[PDB]
Design a binder for this molecule. Structure first.
Ligand SMILES: [Zn+2]
Ligand SMILES: [Zn+2]
Lengths: 53, 311, 53, 311
């Protein structure tokens, strides 16, 4: 129920941020698991968004 | 209550050896981790203990410890001290905390009434007696109240919500809770997730890039930012590092307002944390007197080798 | 500890299948979560491996 | 024990109306789901109840039920009947089961001894008295024994392992368990995961492709494949669908070896499951006699509209 806007970081219960106008997301980090099947995948997204190769 | 305290210089000529120790933020990566604290965003589900266990596995550590237990269902700011800095979380016991909470009322209450009643809960409350610094209502949708609250250390939000429900006459339940601040740790660029740690550790160990893991871990000194400090001479650092209590002659400068019994952080002239301790005298006494024990050291962080005793 | 070879489906404790010679994987399906952040991602892999667009 | 039973034809001339009902595997997608069973690979962690709850949410169902509870830590074959077929899992209560288990011995035992002792546990065992059809040791590495075991319904593997540990004198613990078979459900192309279901449901509801969801769900008839069957005339289907018990005159053909008290599946001439019931007489009596109640229907699956009563 508690959500936050990726932009101003506003906490809200609404699906769309009231002060910015954007789809808000759950105000809590993803569940963690020792498996992490997509670890290599998301690392490639970062390793590319940060410029590492 | 995190307003910069005044600093009073006792020894204007004190200087420090640039070869001994390191500026807190300029420590070789391994040392940085050995004396680091993570501003972790705890995910809901696992217990804090379990989260710390995960951190030890991810960073291949032997020791780690959290400051301010967050319940299983609660997410947010979870300071986790690592290895040699593990016990620095003790500096967070008296730290104030901020939370964002979703309260669900068990009966309909007018929006005007909710705002007035939650305005009266600011200040002293008994759950025994703790202080609520502020209650900021973010949103109100019928029976759901989303609010931000600043509280003194040890304040139970669930109980606070229960009492608010009693005051409203309809009763209330805490549907969700997220810690947004614990002492100097808050939701800023330093807040990292377990996945962030896994990936940054990979970039370091596999790709040889320490930049990200370095930024993901803060120097342990971050944990005592809200504590009164006492800066000491290099020679006094060696003595304290070897187990001695701090004596007045070793003090270079210190914060004003320190009083006997207060938890203080002993610092080197390079702002490195030497040890945590209980002040044995007040700031004034430490400045006036020229002898005696100024601090009863409870925990030493500084290794014996940074500021070596040389005979 | 219980692993299986993606090929012959052999159950083993070893990291490499004894009868085929390939890296075995944990003999149990991935943990499930109502979040499923990569749902769209893996669907694109299937939606492409099956030919859907 | 899943050997094709012999079929004895009582009415060689019986025919069925192609307009009434549907061949089990040719049901419109909605109906297929309404009368379907999922051969799910349960993931370790959640309870079976929780897994079923997830399935109801994913497939937007009102009802669903599992056959043969698998414990939280156990993974593998978990038949989940959906909506109108929910109760068909009752046909699985007497079904045999196969598991793959990892046993950890609490003391060193020679490989030759382990193999001999686990060879003697095949057959009757008391945990009260259940039958172990086979114990196939896959691998042995010191104290770890990976084995496959076929067992009668209701056999507790944890207890079986405990008894094997007692026989070895060192004691044993069940480190991991995975069900590889439950009656007619096994690890074959029909075994699907929760993620598979989520994606296939998406391909159906968003992309309009029912092929995958269809293949991911089996007709409820799959659940009674190991049960003795009685095939009935179209007219008898209507009567049974409307709550009546099955009478001898409605029987077209049936499996041999059925005896009073046995759980039987009543089928239409198109091999659709009509109802589950308790046989009131033996196969021979059903063939010889010409009247009387042949089966006491306990649960009807066939809707009243497929083979309508027309006055
Ligand atoms: Zn915003
Ligand atoms: Zn293989």
């Amino acid at each position: 129920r508690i959500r936050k806007c990726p932009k101003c970081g506003r906490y809200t219960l609404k699906e769309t941020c009231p002060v910015c106008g954007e789809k808000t997301k759950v105000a809590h980090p993803p569940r963690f698991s020792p498996e992490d099947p997509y670890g290599e995948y998301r690392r490639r997204l970062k390793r590319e968004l940060l410029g590492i190769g | 209550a995190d307003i910069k305290r005044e600093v009073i210089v006792k020894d204007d000529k004190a200087e420090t050896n640039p070869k001994w120790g390191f500026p807190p933020d300029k420590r070789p990566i391994e040392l940085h981790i050995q004396y680091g604290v993570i501003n972790l965003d705890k995910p809901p589900g696992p217990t804090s203990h379990e989260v710390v266990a995960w951190i030890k596995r991810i960073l291949n550590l032997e020791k780690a410890g959290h400051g301010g237990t967050l319940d299983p269902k609660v997410s947010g700011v979870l300071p986790v001290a690592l290895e040699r800095a593990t016990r620095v979380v003790q500096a967070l016991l008296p730290a104030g905390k901020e939370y964002v909470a979703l309260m669900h009322l068990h009966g309909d209450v007018p929006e005007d009434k909710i705002r007035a009643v939650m305005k009266e809960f600011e200040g002293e409350i008994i759950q025994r007696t703790r202080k609520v610094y502020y209650i900021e209502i973010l949103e109100i949708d019928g029976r759901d109240v989303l609010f931000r609250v600043g509280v003194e250390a040890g304040t139970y939000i669930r109980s606070l919500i229960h009492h608010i429900g009693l005051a409203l006459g309809v009763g209330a339940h805490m549907a969700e809770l997220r810690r947004t601040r614990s002492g100097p740790f808050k939701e800023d660029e330093t807040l990292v997730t377990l996945h962030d740690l896994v990936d940054y550790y990979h970039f370091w160990k596999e790709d040889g890039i320490e930049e990200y893991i370095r930024k993901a871990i803060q120097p342990m000194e971050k944990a005592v930012e809200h504590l009164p400090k006492i800066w000491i001479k290099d020679s006094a650092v060696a003595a304290v590092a070897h187990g001695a209590n701090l004596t007045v002659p070793g003090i270079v400068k210190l914060n004003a307002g320190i009083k006997k019994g207060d938890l203080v952080a002993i610092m080197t002239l390079k702002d490195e944390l030497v040890a945590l301790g209980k002040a044995m005298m007040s700031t004034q006494e430490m400045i006036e007197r020229s002898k005696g024990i100024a601090v009863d050291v409870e925990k030493v962080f500084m290794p014996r080798d940074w500021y070596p005793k040389l005979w």
